[PDB]
Nucleic acid binder design. Structure first.
Lengths: 81, 81, 107, 188, 109, 64
RNA sequence: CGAGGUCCCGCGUACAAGACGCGGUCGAUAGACUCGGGGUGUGCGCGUCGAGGUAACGAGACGUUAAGCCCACGAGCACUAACAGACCAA
RNA sequence: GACACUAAGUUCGGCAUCAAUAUGGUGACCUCCCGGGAGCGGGGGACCACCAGGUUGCCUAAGGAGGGGUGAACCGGCCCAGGUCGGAAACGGAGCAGGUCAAAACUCCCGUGCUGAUCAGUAGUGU
C-alpha cells in the first residue's frame, strides 16, 4: 500500500511560503488528491489544514502546498523535522 | 599629442555611397596608425558621431582629430576637436 | 670503533669537496652503501650497514644516495683483522674495484 | 648676484644694458661675447647686482647661458616687440630652452619677459606677446624633438610654472625703462 | 588573491594568538569542550615547520598570484626549497597542495 | 533482513500492528532526514519498505 | 656582393583575381585648408509692405543676398599620411 | 661666386681601447700522504680563472693593473637565521632565504684607439 506523504519539499520558495504565508510544502503521491493530502497532513503533524493546492511536477511526483491555520503556524511544525 | 587633419575621407567616395560612414571610420583609423607609427587606434565616440552626423551616406570630406601617443608600445587615443 | 665508509667516498661523480676519497680512475659510478657492504662482507671483513645514516656533504635525500657502512679493521687486542687491509683507503679501493663486478651491475 | 639678459639677436639686450648703466644711448653692433658690469639698484639700501649681457647669436646663446646660469639671481628675456609677429617661432623656441634651464636649477632664478622697442608704432603689447607665446609654447612641448612645461592635459600658461615669471614693457630709445628698473629693484 | 606570503602571515597571527589561549577558553559560545585536550602545542609546531619551508622560497614565489603554479612550470625550484629547509621533495609538494586548498576556500570566503 | 518471516509469524496480531506502526515511524523519520539530507544508509530505507510489506502480507495470511 | 627585382607605403593614365603604370621628403602621390573653376537659383533671421481682421492672426512681396548650400576638376600649399623596414639576387 | 679635397672644430652615441711576465691573494679542480669512531684535524705536489698594486716587451693610430652597476630562484665568491646532516655532547659540515663583495660572468661611465651621426662652416689647395 502506498503512503500519501513522501517528504517535505524544502526550497527557497517553500521557505517563503512557510515564513510568510505560513504554508507547508510536501511531495505526495500523484493521485493522493486533495482531501487525502489534507487528512494525511493533519494526522501526521497534529494540525489544522485550511487548504491544499496541488501540482503534477515534472519530477514524476506531485507537490502539495498545504496552508495551516493561524494558531497552528508553520515554521514550528517544520522545525521539528 | 598633436592635431591632424584627416583627409583619407576623400578615398571613401571610392566605395558606394550608402556605406561611406563605415569606410570613413576605417580610414581615420589607418591614418592615425600610419603617421604616427607609435599610435594604436582607439577612436573616441565623438569622432564616430562626427562622421555619422548626416547619416551613413553623407560623411564630411575632412575631420580634425586630436590624437595622443604613449610612447612605449605605440598606443593612441583620439577624439574630435 | 669500526670505521666509516660513506658512498660519497667512492663516487666518481663527486668532486673532492663533495666527498670523494679515491682517484676518479678508481672511483665508481654510483656506489650504494648496500653494494659496499655486500663486497666487504664477502672477503672476510666484519661489517654492518647503517641503512639510514646520511653523509653531511650530501644535499640529496633519496635512498640510492644514503646509508653508511661500518667495518672492523683491528681487533680489540690490536692485530688487523685481515693483513691485506691496513688502512681505510685500503678498503675504499678494494670496494671501488669489486662493485663494478657485482652481478647486479653487470646485469 | 647676476641678472642675465638673453634674447634673439637685435632684441635690444646691449642697448638696455647701456641705458641701465649710464642712462644714455650708444651705437652698438652684434655682440660676440658677454659683457658685464655692476648696477646699483634704485631702492633705499641700494643693493648691487651684476648685469650680464649675453650674445643672442644661435652659435653662442646656449654655450653662454649654460656657463652663467647657476650664477643667476634673475633672467631678463628681451623681446623685440615690433618684430614679434614675424619672429614668434624663434622667440618661443629660445624661451622654451630658457624655461627648461631655469627650472632644472636648484634655486630657480626669477624670470622677466621684457617686451622692448615699445617706442616703435607697430609694437605688440606685452599682453598680446604673452598670449601668443603661451599658445606657441603649448605646441612646442608636443612637437619638441624629464622636465616639462605645466600640465600635459591643460593648455600651457606661464602661471602653471614653478617659477616667478613677469611681463613688462620698455624702450631703450632718454628711454622708458622705469618698470624694468622697478622690477630689478624688486628682485635685488 | 591569496598568496604564499599571505598564508605565511596568517600562520604567524595564528601562532601568536595561541598562548593568549587561556583567555579564549574563558569565553562562551564555543560549544562544549573548547580546546581540550590538548593538541595545540603539536599543531603550532606544524605551522612553524611549514613557515621554515617558505623561508627557503623567494619573493617571486611568495608574492606570486599562484605560488603553486610557479613550481609546476619550474620543478627545479622545488628541489632547492627542500634542500634549504632540510625537508624532502614530497614535503614541499604537500605544502603546495595544502596552500592550494587554503587559497581555494579563502576566495570561497 | 534484521526482521525475518518466522519472527513475523511468531508475533501476535497485535504485535504486528505495533511493529507495523513502528516501522512506518522509522520510515517517516528516514524520509525526514532525507529531506533535510538524510544522514544515511540507503539499504535500510529500502528494507523498511519490504519489512512493512512482509508484515502486511502476513497479517493478510493469518487473518489479522 | 651587389645591377636589378619582389614585398611594403601613397596613388592611378591600369584593373573581376593576377597583371599594368606612377610617386615615395633629393617628395606635390593622396587627404585637409585656401583660392581658381563649376552646379543650383537667393538661405536663417530680422525690417518694410500685404488681401483683410478689434485684435489675435496673416498666403505671399521686397531688402539684407551673385545669397545660402554644394562639387567625383585644377592650382597654391609639406599641415597630415607616403613611415618603418623586409626580402631575392649571378 | 658655386662647388670639391686635406688639415680641423662642436655635440650626442659615432667608431674603437694589446701582449707576455714576477710576487702576494681569492676561487675552482686534480693528485699524493699522516691522524681519526663520525662531522673531520694535519701536511706535499699540479693545473686553470680572477684580483692588488709592480715590470716589460721593442707592442698598436691608441691600449691606464681607473670608477660604478648588476650578480641572476638555484646555476659567482664570501657571512650564513631557521631547518638539515654527523655527533651522547662539544661542536662541525652541506646549505635556501637574508645580507654582502679588491677578486665567475655581464655590463656602464672615465683618459687613450678605431668609430657611426651631428653641427660648424673657419685654415689651406683644386675646379
Amino acid at each position: 500500500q502506498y503512503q500519501i506523504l513522501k517528504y517535505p519539499l524544502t526550497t527557497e520558495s517553500a521557505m517563503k511560503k512557510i515564513e510568510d504565508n505560513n504554508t507547508l510544502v510536501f511531495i505526495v503521491d500523484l493521485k493522493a488528491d486533495k482531501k487525502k493530502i489534507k487528512a494525511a497532513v493533519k494526522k501526521m503533524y497534529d494540525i489544522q489544514a485550511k487548504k491544499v493546492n496541488t501540482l503534477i511536477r515534472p519530477d514524476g511526483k506531485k507537490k502539495a502546498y498545504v496552508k495551516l491555520t493561524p494558531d497552528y503556524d508553520a515554521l514550528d511544525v517544520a522545525n521539528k523535522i | 599629442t598633436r592635431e591632424y587633419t584627416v583627409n583619407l575621407h576623400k578615398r571613401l567616395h571610392g566605395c558606394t555611397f550608402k556605406k561611406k560612414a563605415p569606410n570613413a571610420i576605417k580610414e581615420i583609423r589607418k591614418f592615425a596608425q600610419k603617421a604616427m607609427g607609435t599610435n594604436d587606434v582607439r577612436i573616441d565616440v565623438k569622432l564616430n558621431k562626427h562622421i555619422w552626423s548626416s547619416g551613413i551616406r553623407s560623411v564630411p570630406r575632412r575631420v580634425r582629430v586630436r590624437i595622443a601617443r604613449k610612447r612605449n608600445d605605440e598606443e593612441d587615443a583620439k577624439e574630435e576637436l | 670503533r669500526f670505521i666509516c665508509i660513506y658512498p660519497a667516498y667512492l663516487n666518481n661523480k663527486k668532486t673532492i669537496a663533495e666527498g670523494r676519497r679515491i682517484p676518479i680512475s678508481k672511483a665508481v659510478e654510483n656506489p650504494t652503501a648496500t653494494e659496499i657492504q655486500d663486497v666487504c662482507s664477502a672477503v672476510g671483513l666484519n661489517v654492518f650497514l647503517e641503512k639510514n645514516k646520511m653523509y653531511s656533504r650530501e644535499w640529496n635525500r633519496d635512498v640510492q644516495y644514503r646509508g653508511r657502512v661500518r667495518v672492523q679493521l683491528k681487533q680489540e687486542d690490536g692485530s688487523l683483522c685481515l693483513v691485506q687491509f691496513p688502512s681505510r683507503k685500503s678498503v675504499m679501493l678494494y670496494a671501488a674495484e669489486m662493485i663494478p663486478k657485482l652481478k647486479t651491475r653487470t646485469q | 648676484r647676476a641678472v642675465l639678459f638673453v634674447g634673439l639677436c637685435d632684441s635690444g639686450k646691449t642697448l638696455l644694458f647701456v641705458r641701465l648703466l649710464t642712462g644714455q644711448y650708444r651705437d652698438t653692433q652684434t655682440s660676440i661675447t658677454d659683457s658685464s658690469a655692476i648696477y646699483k639698484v634704485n631702492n633705499n639700501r641700494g643693493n648691487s647686482l651684476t648685469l650680464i649681457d649675453l650674445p643672442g647669436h644661435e652659435s653662442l646663446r646656449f654655450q653662454l647661458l649654460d656657463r652663467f646660469k647657476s650664477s643667476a639671481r634673475a633672467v631678463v628675456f628681451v623681446v623685440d616687440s615690433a618684430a614679434f609677429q614675424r619672429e614668434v617661432k624663434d622667440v618661443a623656441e629660445f624661451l622654451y630652452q630658457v624655461l627648461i634651464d631655469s627650472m632644472a636649477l636648484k634655486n630657480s632664478p626669477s624670470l622677466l619677459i621684457a617686451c622692448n622697442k615699445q617706442d616703435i608704432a607697430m609694437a605688440k603689447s606685452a599682453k598680446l606677446i604673452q598670449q601668443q607665446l603661451e599658445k606657441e609654447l603649448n605646441t612646442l612641448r608636443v612637437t619638441r624633438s624629464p622636465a616639462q612645461l605645466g600640465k600635459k592635459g591643460k593648455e600651457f600658461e606661464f602661471s602653471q610654472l614653478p617659477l616667478k615669471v613677469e611681463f613688462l614693457e620698455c624702450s631703450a630709445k632718454s628711454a622708458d625703462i622705469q618698470d624694468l628698473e622697478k622690477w630689478l629693484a624688486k628682485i635685488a | 588573491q591569496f598568496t604564499l606570503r599571505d598564508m605565511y602571515e596568517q600562520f604567524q597571527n595564528i601562532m601568536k594568538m595561541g598562548p593568549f589561549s587561556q583567555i579564549l577558553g574563558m569565553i562562551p559560545g564555543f560549544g562544549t569542550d573548547f580546546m581540550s585536550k590538548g593538541n595545540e602545542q603539536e599543531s603550532m609546531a606544524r605551522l612553524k615547520k611549514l613557515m621554515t619551508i617558505m623561508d627557503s622560497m623567494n619573493d617571486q614565489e611568495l608574492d606570486s598570484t599562484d605560488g603553486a603554479k610557479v613550481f609546476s612550470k619550474q620543478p627545479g625550484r622545488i628541489q632547492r626549497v627542500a634542500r634549504g629547509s632540510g625537508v624532502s621533495t614530497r614535503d614541499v609538494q604537500e605544502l603546495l597542495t595544502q596552500y592550494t586548498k587554503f587559497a581555494q576556500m579563502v576566495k570561497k570566503m | 533482513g534484521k526482521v525475518k518471516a518466522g519472527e513475523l509469524w511468531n508475533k501476535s496480531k497485535d504485535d504486528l500492528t505495533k511493529q507495523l506502526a513502528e516501522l512506518k515511524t522509522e520510515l517517516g523519520q528516514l524520509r525526514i532526514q532525507k529531506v533535510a539530507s538524510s544522514g544515511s544508509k540507503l539499504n535500510r530505507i529500502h528494507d523498511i519498505r519490504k519489512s512493512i510489506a512482509r508484515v502486511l502480507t502476513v497479517i493478510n495470511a493469518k487473518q489479522r
